Each structure stands twice: as structure tokens, then as C-alpha cells.
Amino acid sequence: TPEDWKALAADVRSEFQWAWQGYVAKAWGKDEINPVSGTSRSFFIEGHDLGLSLVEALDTLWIMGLDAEFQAGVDWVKANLSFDVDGNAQVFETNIRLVGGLLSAHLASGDPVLLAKARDLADRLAKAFEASPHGLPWRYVNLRTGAVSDPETNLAEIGTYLSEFGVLSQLTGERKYFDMAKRAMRHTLDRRSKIGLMAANIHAMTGAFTSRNASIDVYADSFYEYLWDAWALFGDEDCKRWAVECVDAQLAHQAKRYDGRLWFPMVDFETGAVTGTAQSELAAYYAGLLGQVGRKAQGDDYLASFTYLQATFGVIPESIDVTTGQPRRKHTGLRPEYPDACLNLWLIDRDPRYRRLAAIHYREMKATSRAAFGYTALKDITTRPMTQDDNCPGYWWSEQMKYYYLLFSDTPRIDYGQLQLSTEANVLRGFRKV
Ligand SMILES: CO[C@H]1O[C@H](CO)[C@@H](O)[C@H](O)[C@@H]1S[C@H]1O[C@H](CO)[C@@H](O)[C@H](O)[C@@H]1O
Ligand SMILES: [Ca+2]
Ligand SMILES: [Ca+2]
């Protein structure tokens, strides 16, 4: 019997609404729900929540036609959400989750207050860039005072701003946001080695690399996405060039096969010698990026490595040893990168194979992570049943439920040909208002 995709989309929507009801009941205005205990936790600043999961959920709610829920969230933001807070926030997370979540909600609704708040927050983050003579942001900034801390940063945390900041520039008319984000990326690209790689670790004050490890994985990953995404969103010719150059250097020097499967271990950024044996689950994003930049066959080959992990382990292990293809960790973060890749590859030619693979992933989420008041990260994927931890990460609200729904629903609320997603799955182009 063929899959009824519209029925599966309706199930995703029903589950998302049910989870939202749990958030309203147990964690209203709080950063994250802990859906096993039915409690909440803070994310950015302990004891000073910023409605994180509410903000992350907004564009998903709108796309699903959960309009009353969307409006309840928007109305909470407009009455309550302030960033004039004497506490330290991690610049990268604050941008991709809160700036991006407010921007997607603004684009869906047209509500100027959501743009005002996104821009206020971006101006607070700008102080972290201004505190470096290179324009490389410090990792943490005090939202009220502008004081910075921790300049020992990385490509992801200096280079995952251009989509949100560039959209701010388009909407506001002020080019400063785009320019600030692009300058930080150019800095590290100008320090590529002769083999075209950057080390992942960079110092905001010296402007120098602080390791020799090139990576496609955690601490690097979304830099490479945002090069392509800036071409797609803004027509930026430098970023188009840089995206393809970086990926082809990675394919030349980091693509390695182990037991017949493609992986991308870390390598010395100058010599290409392999310097690690781990790959995280989060690297699955790269299968989709490979397709986006015109390397679809290679993207499908990399997706197949993660499809192997899903078929073998049920849930993709949080980290594996590439030399054995086995888990290095037993816990998970309820991670979204596999359906991320499936959606991105599916947007190319609508191949039903990607729907089939994402349906496995959704059903496995239901079979493993469902708790009393929502969906939770896992303690141990090796027990039967898999044991649960007690946390719904904020990204769940923006990412995998949206990915599943976009893959299955063919919703008229999205122009699929114009759809653009941030690394947190915030929709930055493609809304079709009702
Ligand atoms: C620790 O891993 C996170 O942060 C580093 C930067 O410190 C990133 O390089 C890494 O990709 C993730 S954030 C990444 O994954 C999340 C979902 O698993 C989500 O916030 C979003 O997809 C983000 O791109
Ligand atoms: Ca991501
Ligand atoms: Ca992407």
C-alpha cells in the first residue's frame, strides 16, 4: 500500500499541536520543556528565560495552519519579550534561534513588532563583532552592557549570521548587518591553506587559527551552508564562489571511504593528513549542502552513510567512529539533521525516496522519544526500549517537525521553488500568505 503523504502530514501536525499544548501547560514563556517531568528549563541565561521554544515554534505553527497557536505565541512575544537583560548570551545560538525565529515569524505575519525585536537583538549582538579589530564576534555578550567574553571561537560561531543579518539589511534598508556578517567570513576564507581548507578554531582578537583541524562537522558546518545560502538569498557572487571552492576542497581532501561508506573526518588544514576518526550525527546536514551546490551524487553517497546508521541503530548515534561505523556515544540530542538533508535533496527533483527515508525517521522519533508532555532526547539508544532523558531541545520546534511537514504536506502556504531555510530551519523566503 502506497504511503498517503497527506495523511502523514496531518499526523505530524496533530503531534506538533499536542506538543504545543504540553508547552503551554508546563512551560509557557520558558525556554524549553522537560516533557517527562513536565517542567521547564532555561537555555540562554539561568533563571531569565526568553521564551526560546515558543519563538522557535512560530514559523512551524504558521506553516502548519495552526493559526490560533501561532497568534498566541506572537501575542506573547509582543507583550513580554525583552532583551534588555544583564546577563551573558551565546552570540551564535542567540542569532540562529532568536533573531532567526523572530525573522521567520515576521515574514509569515507581516507584524512590524517582530522585526523591531529581531533588530533590537541583532544590535545587541553587534557589540560582540565590534569588540574585535577583525570583526570576528566574541562568543558571549552581555545583552544589556555589551561586555564580551571568550574569544576562542570557531567557524560556525563566527560565520552563521549572514542569512539572518542579510535579511535584516534587506528589510530595514541598513546594509551594516550584511556587511558585518560577511566581513567575518571573508577573514577566515582569506586564510585558507594552499589546499583550500580553513582550520575550525579561530581567535577573535589575534585573528589566527588556534588549531590545525579542518572540519565539515561541529564548530564548522554552518559556515559552509551560509556561503551557499547568501548566494541563494542575496545573489552574492563572492559567497557563490566561496561555497563551491570550499566544498570542492573538502571533497578533494576530507572525503574518505571506510568499509565502503563515505565519511568526512577532520584533517590537517595544510597537509591533509587525517587528524580524527569521529563523525557526529550533525554532519548529515552536509549531504543536503552537497546537493545544493551542484554535487548531488556525492550528497546522496553521504546521505547513504547516515541511512546505514538509521537502519542499523534505529536512531542515528550522536557520534560514530568512522573506522568501524559504530557508536561512540549512547545518548542523543533529538537531532534534526537527517530530515534536514532529506528535505534539501528532495527540493532538487522531488524524488520520493527522500520521503520514504524521512518517514522512517519520523516514525522512529514517535517510537522512541514520545513522553507524557512532548518529545524528548534519549539517554541510551542501545537498550530496548531506548531509555529517555528529559528535555525537548528548542531546535525540535523549528526543525524536524517542519522538515517532515514540508516533505509530506505540499502545503499551499509555501512557495516551494522560493523556499529558503536557515541552519535552524527558520524560513527566510517562500511564505505564501493566505
Ligand atoms: C555544539 O554544536 C552546536 O553548536 C556548534 C557551534 O558551537 C555548531 O557548529 C553545531 O552545528 C551545533 S548547532 C546546530 O545544530 C542544532 C541541531 O542539532 C541546531 O541548533 C541547528 O541545526 C544548528 O545548525
Ligand atoms: Ca543546522
Ligand atoms: Ca541548509
Ligand code: NA
Ligand atoms: Na522557527
